[PDB]
Amino acid sequence: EVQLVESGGGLVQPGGSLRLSCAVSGFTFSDNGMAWVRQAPGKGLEWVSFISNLAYSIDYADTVTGRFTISRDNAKNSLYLQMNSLRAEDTAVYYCVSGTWFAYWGQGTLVTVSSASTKGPSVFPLAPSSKSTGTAALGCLVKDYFPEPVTVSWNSGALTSGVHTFPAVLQSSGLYSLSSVVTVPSSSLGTQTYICNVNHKPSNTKVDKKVEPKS
């Protein structure tokens, strides 16, 4: 049971600072070299930094040579990354990673760098179309929020079959927008009730919207 857990990620302003840490279980932390690797949204894996088993060697990527510091505390079995002069292209999921072979990967923590305000979404019902293919469709439009991510459940996780929650898209406005939809039987409309549960951790807003056919 190898585990790597990252913390620290969140929204930062450009030229601002943010301290990432990674805690570890299931193997001898001090026998192992460690790394950070990042993945910009929609892009490949990019190696950031590396630190030796006893902190004697450290290595960095060209992009972050000036502003990123890798440090660790073997006594506390924890790995750190201090990121000082943050730009927009540093925005990514940051993975804590075992240094030999890159064999074990944390789940990642999302770092977002921009000057935009954290904004909560608005949730609008996508009311079910009148015609019956006997399939109807319905949904939730989650519009104008920043930053990522948002999560969408239906009836508190009880409805899962037929559900497509889409990848978000960045509007011209510089705000993210998103739809989650579900296909159902047409006859089931009167007998079943459809509520979308939208949670936006960054803004700390949570909204439940009832979807029903137009009056």
Binding site: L45, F50, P125, A137, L141, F166, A168, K214
Partner: protein, 218 residues
């Protein structure tokens, strides 16, 4: 300093058929040790990456015998003897041999499947969105294959451009099908003025382009 180039960029496969990927390096990765520190990885959709093959050919623990690692010098190969739907995702190569440590740009493996046409649905703006001052008209394409598709918006038969954007799901676990949304943005003021809003969908699995629409009243 040491550059990794993967081929091909995208690879769709019929399940049970074989698969093959190459990773080519700018400088020989052979070292004085006698070990070549080249490794292969998989990132399944929504998931963190994970080690498959290490030091060219060794299978990491947890990893099926279907996966093979091969080659030397500048040129290296990952093989999947029999492809499964488990295997969908992006495959990367990497070296830990000299600094800086470098990855490939990756190879997306997609599942090849029989053609299937989309069910199509169209949604007017909510009264709540109109009360805001914006309008967005959403057009859904559910459970279709393959991916490539032309969704086109008409307001009173005026073709629209540059005011719609699309997102696509990852292909389904059971189904292997995609789904897709197209979202058309317009002003409240303009939405009120016009009558008939139409989503024209073209797809290989349709004999000819198909349309779903509404009139603002009912």
């Amino acid at each position: 300093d040491i550059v990794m180039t993967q081929s091909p960029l995208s690879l769709p496969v019929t399940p049970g058929e074989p698969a093959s990927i190459s990773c080519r390096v700018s400088q020989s990765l052979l070292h004085s040790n006698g070990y070549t520190y080249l490794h292969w990885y998989l990132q399944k959709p929504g998931q963190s990456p994970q080690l498959l093959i290490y030091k060219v050919s060794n299978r990491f623990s947890g990893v099926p015998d279907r996966f093979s690692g091969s080659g030397s010098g500048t040129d290296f190969t990952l093989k999947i003897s029999r492809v499964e739907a488990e295997d969908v995702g992006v495959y990367y190569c990497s070296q830990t041999r000299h600094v800086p440590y470098t990855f490939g740009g990756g190879t997306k493996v997609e599942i090849k499947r029989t053609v299937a046409a989309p069910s199509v649905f169209i949604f007017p703006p909510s009264d709540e969105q109109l009360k805001s001052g914006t309008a967005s008209v959403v057009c859904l394409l559910n459970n279709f294959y393959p991916r490539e598709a032309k969704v086109q918006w008409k307001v009173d038969n005026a073709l629209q451009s540059g005011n719609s954007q699309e997102s696509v799901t990852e292909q389904d676990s059971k189904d292997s099908t995609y789904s897709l949304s197209s979202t058309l943005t317009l002003s409240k003021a303009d939405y009120e003025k016009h009558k008939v809003y139409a989503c024209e969908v073209t797809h290989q699995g349709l004999s000819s382009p198909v349309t779903k629409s509404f009139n603002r009243g009912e």
